[PDB]
From a paper:
Three DNA polymerases (Pols), α, δ, and ε replicate the genomic DNA in eukaryotes, with the latter two possessing the proofreading exonuclease activity required for high fidelity DNA synthesis. PCNA encircles the duplex DNA and tethers Pol δ to the DNA enhancing its processivity from few nucleotides to hundreds of nucleotides per DNA binding event. Mammalian Pol δ consists of a catalytic subunit and three regulatory subunits. The catalytic subunit (p125) harbours the polymerase and exonuclease activities, and a metal-binding C-terminal domain (CTD).
We show that this complex exists in alternative conformations where key interactions regulating the holoenzyme activity are lost. Such heterogeneity was especially evident in the particle dataset from the sample fast-frozen immediately after mixing of the components, while it was significantly less prominent when the sample was separated by gel filtration prior to freezing, suggesting that the complex conformation may stabilize overtime. In agreement, 3D classification of the first dataset identified different holoenzyme conformers in which the orientation of the PCNA ring plane varies in a range up to ~20°. The PCNA tilting also modulates the distance between a loop on the polymerase thumb domain and a loop on the PCNA front face. The contact between the two loops is visible in the lowest PCNA tilt conformer (Class 1, 4.3 Å resolution), which is the most populated (65%). However, the density at this contact is weak suggesting that the two loops interact in multiple orientations. Mutation of the highly conserved D41 residue on the PCNA loop or K931A on the thumb loop reduced the activity of Pol δ and severely compromised its processivity. We propose that dynamic interactions among PCNA loops and both the thumb and the CTD of p125 may keep PCNA in a position that is competent for DNA polymerization.
Numbering used by the authors:
A (entry chain B): 1 to 108, 124 to 254, 271 to 462
B (entry chain D): 42 to 107
C (entry chain A): 1001 to 1107
D (entry chain C): 2 to 144
Amino acid sequence: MFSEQAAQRAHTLLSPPSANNATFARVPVATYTNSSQPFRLGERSFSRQYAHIYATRLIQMRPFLENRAQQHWGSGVGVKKLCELQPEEKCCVVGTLFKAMPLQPSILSKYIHPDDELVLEDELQRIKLKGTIDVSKLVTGTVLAVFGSVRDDGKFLVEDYCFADLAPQKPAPPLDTDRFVLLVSGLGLGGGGGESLLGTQLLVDVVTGQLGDEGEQCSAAHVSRVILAGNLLSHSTQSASVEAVKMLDEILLQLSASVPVDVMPGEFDPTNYTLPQQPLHPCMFPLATAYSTLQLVTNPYQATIDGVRFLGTSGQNVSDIFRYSSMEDHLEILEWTLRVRHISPTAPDTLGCYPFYKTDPFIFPECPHVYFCGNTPSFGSKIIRGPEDQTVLLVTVPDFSATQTACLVNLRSLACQPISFSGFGAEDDDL
Amino acid sequence: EEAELELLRQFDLAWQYGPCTGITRLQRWCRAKQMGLEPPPEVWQVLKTHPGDPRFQCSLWHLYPL
Amino acid sequence: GLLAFAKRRNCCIGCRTVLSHQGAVCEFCQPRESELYQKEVSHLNALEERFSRLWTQCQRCQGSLHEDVICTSRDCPIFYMRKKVRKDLEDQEQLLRRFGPPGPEAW
Amino acid sequence: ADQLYLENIDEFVTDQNKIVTYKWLSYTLGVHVNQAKQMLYDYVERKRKENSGAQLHVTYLVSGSLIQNGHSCHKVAVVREDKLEAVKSKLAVTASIHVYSIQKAMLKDSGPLFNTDYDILKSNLQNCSKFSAIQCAAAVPRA
Ligand code: SF4
Ligand SMILES: [Zn+2]
């Protein structure tokens, strides 16, 4: 990929001065299209209630689950509404989960408890559930189909159940010369060390073209874009924040000089709290708004970068699922989120969102080629396949303040390589 | 009138068009038409032969501090 | 009676001086506007977090997640504490539209 | 020619008792970055061949590929003067070697090497792509 090509030449720099030194040029970004328009909210009227969201979620997700239960259990179909069930008869039900957990805090670290019930709910009534089903892997808000019978105590006995699955995916055109994309998250400007300072300096010095030989300068010239994904100012306590936007403005100036940059709000960043987070206001960045290479977006970010389509968050859905479930692997939680056809199924019950009423926008309408996450504690990447011809690369971006690691994504081979930065510390090997 | 005020009160409580006590009446009529559940072409034909009257173009409980 | 015949005079967010035009900042208190935007968006952020914890608690006290809430229980603190945050949010959202929009929306 | 920057470095280092990175010595003398690294290597080679016992400390940079557990990572490190060859032998592929800094009296960690670059950036803010090896085209002040 990158470090293979970075040694492909001769080395000139352990030498006395010369007449000329080589220069290069940044590769063109001749196609780009932002398609994150359902997350940019222009009107923003509150004063509705959260019942309009669940109803449109069920009404939109129902035909997918009917069409999958047909070909997953046989076209001798027995799909039936929750009220028209007769005692001890084999049928299929399509509904919404609700997990009834105590230890979840009310108004007046994991939170799973050894006893907690699942309830299948439709628009008119509910029913309890027991049998062969996982009690702690599933969360409230998933829509699914299920197979079984109504027993004598009013409960329901489950044999097997199925999720919605992956959406269709059109193929991408192949590329001629490999272009790279760099992904960073969580610089933590405001607190978090001094080795993080030299790490941030060495990272911007490599990507801008100040560091290393003609190998590194030829290979960093091919990096086409830069994406910064959330949690730019890590905060120690709210009640500091004014002096940090000055330094963030300086860093975005030093990056806006050479590359195009995309900046996203995070868990602590001066924006709203609900989930389609709106872009940062330009009045906090005097210096960096001189150039038209800096762009400010928000949370759920879609794009079409050179044919390859991207979609990502700053890691607020994945940690929310991590709170109220039993899965630990963040790459697994990201793939599970992909499997139920919903970016954030736990919303709104433990993760706040705007009260939409026309259409729920967190249902996947297509399949992305790349799908990344936000502030995960360690690097990971994987390739997964669909039932049809659908392949997806899954990346979890590490957190720069502890690991000092970023990710390079190739746009022609579609692979991801880590990059790590480490200056020497107070290290003396004679003690 | 007095027969048109029960048709709208019957459209407002049918559960197969949605859970609607936060929005207008014509917005819920067009929401169901987009998804095309089965809006009937009579709850439209009284919301056109009237102006902006608050006892036609409003949900049943548009008072009521809920 | 008289309360309807308002004039709705705008005021500077920094030093409280009534003046003609709709801009939020005063001409003497301009070099300090990034800090005055920083201040009060951490208030909108904390009102947003209080709207959502309350209006979904009624859904769990009611039983259902798919139908409307009707409970005007005068002995519940939940009622009329869920009514004032709508207006706090209504007011604090409109104070930040004094500042322009952070981008376009018709693209 | 040579005596110009040789005497400039000999008064910056040993008289004013300062810490000279390559970016400071390229913002002082108005030089390209790679030529500044070559200048520093010239000075250290001359004064280390002359005497062998100077009050001179160096710090280098080593970059290149590695495999920890299967995966190919790319490790970049700013290294002292004792531990260079072991770090060079741990790596798989080598991709960049030059010089980073010289000193008079030995430091304890990588503290002031950020203070120097930060302060010389602080006053020199309208140019950072001026001596950069990569010159993009669409980034010119417009808005
Ligand atoms: S207002 Fe209070 S009592 Fe009424 S449903 Fe809400 S939480 Fe329950
Ligand atoms: Zn003022």
